[PDB]
Design a protein around this ligand. Structure first.
Ligand SMILES: Cc1cc2nc3c(=O)[nH]c(=O)nc-3n(C[C@H](O)[C@H](O)[C@H](O)COP(=O)(O)OP(=O)(O)OC[C@H]3O[C@@H](n4cnc5c(N)ncnc54)[C@H](O)[C@@H]3O)c2cc1C
Ligand SMILES: Cc1cc2nc3c(=O)[nH]c(=O)nc-3n(C[C@H](O)[C@H](O)[C@H](O)COP(=O)(O)OP(=O)(O)OC[C@H]3O[C@@H](n4cnc5c(N)ncnc54)[C@H](O)[C@@H]3O)c2cc1C
Ligand SMILES: O=S1(=O)CCN(Cc2ccco2)CC1
Ligand SMILES: O=S1(=O)CCN(Cc2ccco2)CC1
Lengths: 588, 588
């Protein structure tokens, strides 16, 4: 138990000190390591339940049972007299830098998870390199350090969402007494994109400074794992070379998919291209029905666009379908057109994009509805949002032995280990895990702590909350209503629900019974909250806090005994009483 | 014992049926009562764990042990055969209306708590009257049914806060690409007031409709308790008469104080007058430093007023003081002037309010600072927010025997009972309790269930969350940092904290390090979260959900293992790590 933990910790930590808070000999070693600029992990034995057992287990490695004890890459280095000796004799630097590999850690991929892992590992003295390269899109788009979220995901997505929310703010301002006239105000797309790209640029810069300040080596190069410890890198000048590392973290993420139809790659675009587009898309078709599809269609419409979404079958597959339908109806009532039960057959080019005058081209889209009727219509821009996929065939030689699943994602144990014992995987390519930036960050930081600082905490992937930033936002935590009924049966499930109206919407003359909330509960388990769902403004701020209560096992009774904050939207969760089985109306 | 529960339930219920869900005889009785339009409480014995015991004790009243058993105001009425006998003999209506008093319940006060209590009591067959009257302010302001929050509190306050928030939305919109020029836009006070008052008018009317549809008698009259069961009422036409009731609930609230100085009552106003003022206040002095004072000063500045606050000692006495200082510092940087350590001595009239042209008058304010120096300045409007107090002399005859404390508030047990066994008190006049609208509603609804439906649940008044709606809002749940240190000792307290910047502020070029949050925790109790604090946009939405987790006993480990929603402000709580004891900066 304790014995196997100690061996695992000593074997993979890069530099680690065993210590007690009250020991002046340990203080003297800490001071020497600080002065020499030697970073290391520290375990304070006097602060652990079984420090006594741990102190005795150290002797199986060092043949002594006192503190301090210094180790470098699995090897006992000395007590305080020995460490001081090495320091005085100018020998300490060379010992702590002695390694069988170029790096203690190589991270392949410089996104949300990889950056977080690399920075955390370096704080405990691991000699670390992070590799990042951005393969250009079909039309040539490329961007800087930071990954999908920073450059072409969460960050620019929510900034343009905000630009679209401000259009309703301008409308609302008239009713609250401001003198503007919403009817004579227009939006400039390229002004918005300049502002968004300037913030992304400051993040690109920020991460390069953060890696330099943590002594992480940053290589803007494509990586390929060719054996368990060898990473082949290719330059921006196509220079090829090989580096070695003790531990390897794969953190390379995904890229958008294209359907195999004529004209799709040549004439359409994806979200990768959209957030830095130099011209307003104009009349736009969005193909797909994921949260990416619906979020982009939504802000394009709020910014004055003529927008259609082409839906193969359902909206938001895998989310609660009653919530998904309310999301779609609101978008349709505020402008967005939907072509339902429809797929595309080809894209034809009527006009080439005008780089000179900064204007889109023109396309003819042909398709069919599931009953066989035909679809034919002209658009200026066609955005494909039909899923994302890893491309590990590039990153990973088949002979290394890292196992993939039928979608090409990496099969991992619950501590992120692959089938190759020194190789781990995090973020979107970890099979079966929620594909979200806070998950990738948590997994990468927690893993770095286990490898290099002796931590034991695992990442908990259950009941992770989400928010879809559609024009009216949708927050959720836990099971959908249909999944709860599937798992436990209808008679064991109670659902509490209510409509509501934000106070901010009253003077503004907005809709009475559009926002909506429900709790899905299990009768036989003290009416445990199995899932929470809210459609309304600031849905992500509303939901975040409740995700702690659900993690702790909240029941309906816990929600009833907590008091509301007034006036808020979130307080409605604390007074729910209408059940779906009663058949009583949920309106206000 | 189960028997003394059953006893109190039978004596206090107006009309109650003891039943079982599977018995078709109870079903015949239920339908008879439904058709004769008789409302009643129902206790389903085949759902409570000791229903067997209760069935036994019913015999102490009815001499039978079967089900159904119907009771009216403490008296057993019959089983299925007997209830049906009364029905087909036209005797049933007279038996259920037989009472010693005019009403089962008289509520004095038609505000947050009173209306909630009255409506809930009526759902169980209690014959209920709700009394309400609004004594005019010194200048004659009056308003309709609904209480302080609805008319001159939370509702109009938060609508004017939103009007102020929208001026920064107009500034922000330019950076997000919208073509408006903020510098050329002004605000119209009276247009805002008309929209705000039209919403308040729909609430006044909605409450009258709700009372009518619940068969609650509403009397717009001043009530006075002269003996335990007798309430004397006075007409709008000065007509005096007496009504009697079994149970009495006092829910009459508070009104603002004036300082005892020359000119205050004659020439100043308070919050009661502000929300329906027909002219813009103009250059305004707010005297006081409560949440009412800072909230009013804050939106007045955002709507374009010249605004000054005069502070006797500190801001937000009784709230966490590090947070109160950050609140005031934000306001001072955005155009609220403060006159610190200062009190007023007199108000001189220089110009009378111009009713015709819809213009304020002009006043001269004279005061002094704590050193000795003097204050003298003219203002168009002077608003007093120096506290609120009850006026129970008006409501309660001294001889009835209801004990008050030294502030004039009613001393109650933990079930809201006064020193007179049939008289209860709820809301702002219940001594010792948080003075908040959702607390009054929970107290009133829960009490009505105990009196008329055999409920046992009590209101929980601990760790009730709050939000102050200053220009930058401040949400809190639990202890301030100073209260926690004083209760447990500095060595047993750990504080995690961080600055943050909302994503929405990046393109808008707003401030990097003004928003702030912290968790105040107890080391020796598993790092239990004692208090949560957040300064930022949408702070009430952010805080509300964490209140459930704090109710359930959340620890720091619970916050750490929960995953954030990205991008939100609230997610910063899931990754806090900088302790105050460490000395490391909290900035970003
Ligand atoms: C449009 C959109 C919006 C989103 N919005 C949200 C949101 O609001 N909230 C949320 O939580 N999540 C959101 N997500 C999801 C979020 O972006 C991902 O979960 C996250 O970025 C995945 O992180 P990662 O570290 O796994 O991979 P990535 O962030 O994709 O980083 C992988 C990096 O490695 C690089 N790379 C690939 N192969 C190699 C190689 N061989 N050598 C070197 N480098 C390589 C890639 O080019 C990339 O830079 C959104 C995603 C999209 C597409
Ligand atoms: C400016 C301001 C802002 C506020 N903002 C908030 C906020 O954002 N959130 C929050 O939770 N709380 C807020 N509050 C507090 C909230 O308004 C009170 O806690 C709440 O109104 C108390 O309700 P109540 O039922 O105790 O009394 P009230 O709502 O004051 O109702 C009592 C009613 O009884 C009437 N009455 C009095 N005497 C008699 C009599 N003898 N006969 C008949 N009728 C009588 C009164 O005129 C009144 O109509 C605010 C308060 C103020 C002043
Ligand atoms: O082989 S390539 O065509 C594709 C991979 N690239 C690596 C790269 C891109 C940017 C910097 O480094 C070199 C040429
Ligand atoms: O001077 S008063 O008697 C005037 C009338 N009363 C009660 C009342 C009910 C409706 C309007 O007014 C208050 C004091």
């Amino acid at each position: 138990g304790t014995s196997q933990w100690l061996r695992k910790t000593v074997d993979s930590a890069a530099v680690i000190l065993f210590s007690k808070t009250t020991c002046p000999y340990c203080k003297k070693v800490k001071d020497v390591l600080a002065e020499a600029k030697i970073k290391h992990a520290t375990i304070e034995l006097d602060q652990l339940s079984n420090g006594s057992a741990i102190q005795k287990c150290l002797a199986s490695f060092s043949k002594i049972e006192t503190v301090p004890q210094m180790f470098v890459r699995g090897k006992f280095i000395g007590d305080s007299q020995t460490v001081l000796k090495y320091y005085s004799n100018d020998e300490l630097a060379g010992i702590v830098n002695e390694s069988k590999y170029d790096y203690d850690l190589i991270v392949i991929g410089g996104g949300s998870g990889g950056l977080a892992a690399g920075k955390e590992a370096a704080k405990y003295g691991a000699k670390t390199a992070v590799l990042d390269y951005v393969e250009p899109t079909p039309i040539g788009t490329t961007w800087g350090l930071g990954g999908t979220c920073v450059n072409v995901g969460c960050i620019p997505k929510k900034l343009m969402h905000q630009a679209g929310l401000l259009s309703h703010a301008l409308e609302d301002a008239e009713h609250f007494g401001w003198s503007l006239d919403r009817s004579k105000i227009s939006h400039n797309w390229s002004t918005m994109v300049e502002g968004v790209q300037s913030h992304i640029g400051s993040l690109n810069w920020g991460y390069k400074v953060a890696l330099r300040d943590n002594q992480v080596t940053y290589l803007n190069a494509k990586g390929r794992l060719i054996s368990p410890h060898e990473v082949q890198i290719t330059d921006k000048n196509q220079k090829v070379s090989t580096i070695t590392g003790n531990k390897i973290i794969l953190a390379t993420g995904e890229r958008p998919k294209y359907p195999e139809i004529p004209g799709a790659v040549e004439y359409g675009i994806t979200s990768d291209d959209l957030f830095s587009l130099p011209y307003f898309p104009g009349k736009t078709l969005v193909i797909g029905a994921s949260y990416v599809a619906l979020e982009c269609a939504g802000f394009l419409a709020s910014l004055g666009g003529d927008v259609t979404v082409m839906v193969r079958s359902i909206l938001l597959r895998g989310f609660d379908q009653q919530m998904a339908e309310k999301v779609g109806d609101y978008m349709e009532n505020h402008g967005v057109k939907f072509a339902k039960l429809c797929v595309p057959d080809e894209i034809k080019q009527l006009k080439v994009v005008d780089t000179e005058n900064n204007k889109p081209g023109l396309l003819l889209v042909k398709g069919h509805y599931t009953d066989g009727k035909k679809f034919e219509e002209e658009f200026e821009t066609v955005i494909f949002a039909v899923g994302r996929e890893p491309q590990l065939s590039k990153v990973l030689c088949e002979t290394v032995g890292v196992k993939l699943d039928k979608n090409g994602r990496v099969v991992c144990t619950d501590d992120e280990q692959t089938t190759v014992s020194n190789v781990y995987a995090i973020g979107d390519i970890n099979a079966g895990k929620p594909q979200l930036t806070p998950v990738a960050i948590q997994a990468g930081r927690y893993l770095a702590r286990r490898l290099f600082a002796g931590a034991t905490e695992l990442t908990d992937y259950s009941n992770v909350a989400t928010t879809v930033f559609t024009p009216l936002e949708y927050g959720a935590c836990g099971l959908s209503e249909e999944d709860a009924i599937e798992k436990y049966g209808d008679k064991d499930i109670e659902v509490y629900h209510s409509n509501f109206k934000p106070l901010e919407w009253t003077v503004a003359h907005r809709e009475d019974n559009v926002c909506y909330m429900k709790l899905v509960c299990r009768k036989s388990d003290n009416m445990r909250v199995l899932g929470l769902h809210v459609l309304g403004p600031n849905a992500g701020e509303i939901t975040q806090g409740y995700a702690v209560a659900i993690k702790m096992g909240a029941t309906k009774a816990d929600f009833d005994r907590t008091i509301g904050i007034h006036p808020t939207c979130s307080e409605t969760f604390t007074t729910l009483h209408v059940t779906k089985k009663s058949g009583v109306s949920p309106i206000v």
